[PDB]
């Protein structure tokens, strides 16, 4: 809930990956931490490339998906938090953002980064802090 350095340390990377994934424009020179961005950018691009089809099916199966993001995140890492699950959330979050973008109206797209970062931190802050945020992912 609280917007700290941690909240924005994560948001900066998610916000720019969503931007890059939706527009196809390079964001390596807008992010604060360039090395993390490349790693996370590639991690999510692998998950998407291998699971975009499943995402397409699960997404058409779910009406009213914007207000269900916090529940999906909650139900993904409530028993345990791992970087694999955290990355999968970001990747699936990226796909949804593009999907709502191609559906055409942006007001939701402007919120997806904060929505998942909020849901992510609502349960994983101490876990993220105890690894110095993205340092644990290297």
């Amino acid at each position: 809930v609280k917007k700290d350095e941690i909240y924005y340390t994560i948001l900066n990377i998610i916000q720019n990956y969503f931007i890059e994934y939706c527009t196809g424009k390079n964001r390596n020179f807008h992010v604060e931490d360039e090395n993390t961005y490349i790693i996370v950018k590639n991690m999510c691009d692998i998950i998407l490339r291998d699971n975009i089809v499943e995402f397409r099916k699960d997404i058409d199966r779910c009406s009213d998906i914007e207000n269900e993001i916090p529940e999906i995140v909650y139900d993904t890492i409530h028993d345990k938090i791992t970087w694999g699950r955290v990355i999968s959330i970001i990747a699936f979050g990226a796909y949804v953002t593009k999907v709502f973008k191609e559906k055409g109206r942006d007001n939701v797209v402007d919120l997806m980064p904060d929505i998942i970062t909020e849901s992510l931190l609502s349960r994983c802050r101490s876990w993220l802090s105890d690894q110095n945020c993205w340092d644990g992912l290297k």
């Binding site: 779910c62 699950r85 699936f92």
Partner: peptide, 21 residues
């Protein structure tokens, strides 16, 4: 529905995690 998504993000997250240290 929303629970199926969650469980597939866990399969994806767990397999992704095992194959990369």
């Amino acid at each position: 529905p929303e629970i199926w998504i969650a469980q597939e993000l866990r399969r994806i997250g767990d397999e992704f995690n095992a194959y990369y240290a």
